[PDB]
mmCIF file of C-alpha atoms in Angstrom:
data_model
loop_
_atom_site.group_PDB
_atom_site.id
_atom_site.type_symbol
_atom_site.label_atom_id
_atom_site.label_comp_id
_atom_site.label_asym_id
_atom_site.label_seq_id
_atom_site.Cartn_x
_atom_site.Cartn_y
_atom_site.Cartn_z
ATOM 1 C CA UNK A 1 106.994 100.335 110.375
ATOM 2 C CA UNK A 2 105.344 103.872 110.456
ATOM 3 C CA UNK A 3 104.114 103.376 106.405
ATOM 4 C CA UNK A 4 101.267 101.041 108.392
ATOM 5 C CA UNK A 5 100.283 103.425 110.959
ATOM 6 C CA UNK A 6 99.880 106.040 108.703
ATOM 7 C CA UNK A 7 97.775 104.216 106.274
ATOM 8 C CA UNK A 8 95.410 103.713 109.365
ATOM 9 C CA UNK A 9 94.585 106.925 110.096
ATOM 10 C CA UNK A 10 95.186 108.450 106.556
ATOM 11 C CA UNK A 11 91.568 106.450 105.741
ATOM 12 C CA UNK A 12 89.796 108.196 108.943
ATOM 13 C CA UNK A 13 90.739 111.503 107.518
ATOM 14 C CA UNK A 14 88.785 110.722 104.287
ATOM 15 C CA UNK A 15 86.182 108.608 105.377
ATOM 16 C CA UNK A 16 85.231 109.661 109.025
ATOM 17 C CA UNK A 17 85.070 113.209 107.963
ATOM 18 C CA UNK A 18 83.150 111.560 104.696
ATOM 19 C CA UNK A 19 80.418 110.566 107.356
ATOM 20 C CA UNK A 20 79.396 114.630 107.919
ATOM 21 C CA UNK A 21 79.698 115.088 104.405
ATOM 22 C CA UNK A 22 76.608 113.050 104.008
ATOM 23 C CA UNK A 23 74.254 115.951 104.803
ATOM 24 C CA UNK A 24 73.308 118.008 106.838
ATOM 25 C CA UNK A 25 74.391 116.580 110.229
ATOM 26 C CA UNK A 26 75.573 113.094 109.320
#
Protein backbone atom coordinates (compact mmCIF):
# COMPACT_ATOMS: atom_id res chain seq x y z
CA UNK A 1 0.00 0.00 0.00
CA UNK A 2 2.90 2.47 -0.83
CA UNK A 3 0.05 5.56 -1.54
CA UNK A 4 0.13 5.50 2.65
CA UNK A 5 3.74 5.58 3.14
CA UNK A 6 4.21 8.21 0.91
CA UNK A 7 1.61 10.44 2.29
CA UNK A 8 3.68 10.08 5.61
CA UNK A 9 6.65 11.46 4.69
CA UNK A 10 5.31 13.73 1.81
CA UNK A 11 3.90 16.00 5.06
CA UNK A 12 7.59 16.02 6.75
CA UNK A 13 8.90 17.47 3.58
CA UNK A 14 6.51 20.47 3.90
CA UNK A 15 6.11 20.85 7.39
CA UNK A 16 9.46 19.75 9.10
CA UNK A 17 11.37 21.86 6.72
CA UNK A 18 8.31 24.53 7.49
CA UNK A 19 9.80 24.49 11.14
CA UNK A 20 13.30 26.44 9.80
CA UNK A 21 11.25 28.49 7.74
CA UNK A 22 10.01 30.13 10.85
CA UNK A 23 13.04 32.43 11.18
CA UNK A 24 16.04 32.68 11.59
CA UNK A 25 17.08 29.35 13.19
CA UNK A 26 13.74 27.72 13.94
Amino acid sequence: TNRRKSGKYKKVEIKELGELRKEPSL
